[PDB]
């Protein structure tokens, strides 16, 4: 697992690459795996960038945090944009979850660093809305 | 506001 | 909801002090409510300072991110401190991913200044492992 502030923000990183992918150049693809006739779904993102809709993770309680259960049961209800809009910020929150989950033996100094590190990409959410 | 439009039991 | 980062920081003081509660004051009825047989449950903090041990919502996808699940299902299958430290962490993720939740809409200045008032307080684990 990642310990570093630098191994951290690499995974970070790649995982927030492949959220960004399914959610704006892939998101016609990622928008019909998430089938509102399935079981209830999450998005991933993996450290090699790779996004995958699934069931979620099936050791319960899980290593590492996860995503939003169910996505694909609110597509059909709301505007398009709004459903990306949070699918957006629920996937920044898993994020910063995974992250901190991976730096939970950082000191305060360490924190910091690897908060302002992440502060530097946008998030989803602001991509997604164009703020 | 900002919230799900409706949703669904959780599979079980 | 909250909004401002005043809002968002006082909803994560309360959240945290009912979870510090939980494992430290409160920590024997905590882990006996934890039991294994029961259905998945989780640890919630509540910004009335409350903690309780329950189900997950019903319905989904939830308002709120949502804590670890079943975290009973793991209590017996390792020392006790070591489970307690593993929800410490878990119940750290989710504080702060109640906050960044709320805080969606702050700028990068705002997340800033956010995670700063939330990184002066110790962490769950911190002080469930005993670090300073």
């Given at each position: 697992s990642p310990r570093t502030v630098?191994?951290?923000?690499?995974?970070?990183?790649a995982r927030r690459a492949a959220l960004l992918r399914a959610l704006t150049k892939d998101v016609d693809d990622f928008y019909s795996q998430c089938d509102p006739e399935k079981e209830n779904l999450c998005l991933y993102g993996?450290?090699?960038?790779?996004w995958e809709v699934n069931l979620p993770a099936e050791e319960v309680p899980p290593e590492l945090p996860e995503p939003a259960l169910g996505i694909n049961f609110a597509r059909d209800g709301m505007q398009r944009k709004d459903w990306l809009s949070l699918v957006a910020?629920?996937?920044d929150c898993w994020l910063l979850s995974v992250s901190f989950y991976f730096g939970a033996r950082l000191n305060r100094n360490e924190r910091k660093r690897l908060f302002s590190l992440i502060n530097d990409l946008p998030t989803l959410f602001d991509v997604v809305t164009g703020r | 506001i900002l919230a799900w439009g409706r949703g669904?039991?959780?599979?079980?």
């Open positions: 630098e191994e951290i923000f690499k995974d970070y990183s993996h450290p090699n960038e790779s910020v629920h996937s | 669904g039991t959780r599979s079980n």
